[PDB]
Amino acid sequence: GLPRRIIKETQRLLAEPVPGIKAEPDESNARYFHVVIAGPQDSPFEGGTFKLELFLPEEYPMAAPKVRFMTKIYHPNVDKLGRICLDILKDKWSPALQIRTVLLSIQALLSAPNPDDPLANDVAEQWKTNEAQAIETARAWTRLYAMNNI
């Protein structure tokens, strides 16, 4: 009972993958995607492989996909559960967007982290106040969690 666009989107993702992002559907759940985003260069995550799991809900595409990191990462917009604070998965998601647009954002979010509330997130306060040492933290978490984990 796969909707026709989810079928069409999967074939597009496998025919021209996003450079640096591996996205494949699960063998048993065509709405479930296993994502591996490579660490961007000129960033503390460089050389790391970060696992994500994307799930297309049933309201998709009227609702945004539910994506979340599986690898531990020190990022101001990723909490301890792996939730990515992005403007798509919250309020201003539109049907014009798609899966590749979400994957491209998360990849771009690693290179250019955004400001965030320093409360309820000591990572966000550490990035705003002590950037060089917060960047040092992210390189440690990249070797401990994002290297040789695939």
Binding site: P3, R4, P95, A96, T101, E125
Partner: protein, 377 residues
């Protein structure tokens, strides 16, 4: 007391004081900020250390980035409280394809023009429904409703708006969309090809019909607000503009002046800044409209990454304006009045030290308010 006198005065006062330009005491800031931050303080152990940590990490004295609020604060200073309230009573005037209406609304006197730009919030998805099940006082709004004998638009208020389709045309589209996943689907999905199946051709035709009728319906919502200042000069072409702005989750007015973006927008000329701003409402080019929308509204420096990817402005845009003359004898009297209130309550040699004293008092009032609130366990 020239018009560039007051422009340079607000420029240096906003650059150096930020939230202190609003005139609100530090005690009220900390008292109300404790209302938002009370849920983050830990309840076990030393409460003095738990409250201090949340107090340190609060950005309560950081200037606002609400574009509409920065435009309100600029109007209160230049025009006065009553003059700005009278200014709000006036309505906005939409810009044309060449901005000639604003070009003629700028006589060679000191002027203040507020701009309210709207984004076209056209509906993006539909629903097949029997007329028996259609209650317009409960059904989801800003949505297209395809009935067996009428295709209609529910706006953002409650009003049902017909789309001028024959009952036979609606009967054909109603009985063509048959698969269950498409009974409540989106109007313009890029992966829907009308040449594949007869069902998808009916969906695509419905999109072309809705897209045509929406052009004559008011579907705009404000997406940005800013302010432009026009000083009185000895004419010729020594006429210059200076726009003021903040932006949601982007930059503040303090960062705007500090980055001298009001001057990169200055030498663009009177007709130059206006012609490119009218341009922004005309073009349907998607990758050639975000260039402008970033060229005028980005934080200083990032005019090339502010509208890329998903922030790429797809929807149509309109701009509106309203003008009123400013009297510098009252504007500068309002500005040096805040300087007096700042230099009295929080005096200091450096303006950077006067802000530190204001932050400490706001943090003290926030602390005392927090420990009173957290006495309930």
């Amino acid at each position: 007391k020239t018009g560039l006198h007051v422009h340079e005065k607000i420029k240096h006062m906003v650059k150096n004081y930020g939230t202190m330009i609003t005139g609100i005491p530090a005690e009220i800031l900390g008292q109300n900020e404790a209302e938002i931050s009370v849920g983050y303080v830990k309840k076990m152990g030393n409460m003095k250390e738990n409250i201090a940590e949340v107090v340190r990490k609060s950005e309560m004295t950081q200037p606002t980035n609400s574009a509409g609020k920065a435009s309100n604060e600029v109007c209160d200073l230049l025009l006065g409280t009553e003059g700005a309230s009278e200014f709000e009573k006036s309505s906005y005037q939409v810009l044309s394809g060449d901005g000639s209406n604003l070009k003629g609304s700028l006589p060679n006197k000191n002027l203040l023009v507020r701009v309210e730009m709207d984004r076209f919030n056209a509906p993006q998805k539909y629903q097949k429904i029997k007329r028996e099940e259609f209650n317009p006082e409960t059904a989801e709004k800003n949505k297209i409703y395809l009935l067996e004998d009428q295709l209609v638009y529910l706006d953002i208020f409650g009003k049902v708006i017909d789309l001028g389709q024959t009952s036979d045309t609606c009967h054909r589209l109603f009985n063509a969309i048959t698969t269950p996943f498409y009974q409540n689907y989106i109007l313009y999905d890029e992966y829907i090809d009308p040449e594949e199946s007869a069902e998808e051709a009916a969906m695509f035709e419905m999109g072309e019909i809705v897209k045509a009728k929406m052009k004559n319906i008011d579907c705009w919502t404000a997406t940005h607000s800013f302010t432009i200042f026009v000083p009185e000069s000895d004419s010729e072409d020594t006429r210059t503009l200076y726009p003021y702005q903040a932006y949601w989750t982007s930059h503040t007015l303090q960062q705007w002046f500090s980055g001298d973006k009001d001057e990169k927008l200055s030498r663009l000329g009177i007709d130059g800044y206006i012609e490119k701003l009218a341009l922004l409402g005309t073009t349907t080019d998607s990758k050639i409209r975000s260039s402008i929308y970033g060229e005028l509204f980005s934080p200083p420096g990032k005019e090339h990454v502010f509208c890329t990817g998903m922030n790429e402005k797809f929807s149509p845009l309109r701009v509106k304006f309203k003008v009123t003359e400013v009297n510098p004898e009252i504007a500068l009297q309002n500005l040096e009045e805040v300087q007096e209130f700042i230099d009295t309550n929080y005096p200091g040699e450096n303006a950077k030290d006067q802000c530190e004293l204001y932050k400490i008092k706001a943090q003290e009032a926030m602390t005392k308010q927090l420990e009173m609130r957290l006495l309930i366990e």
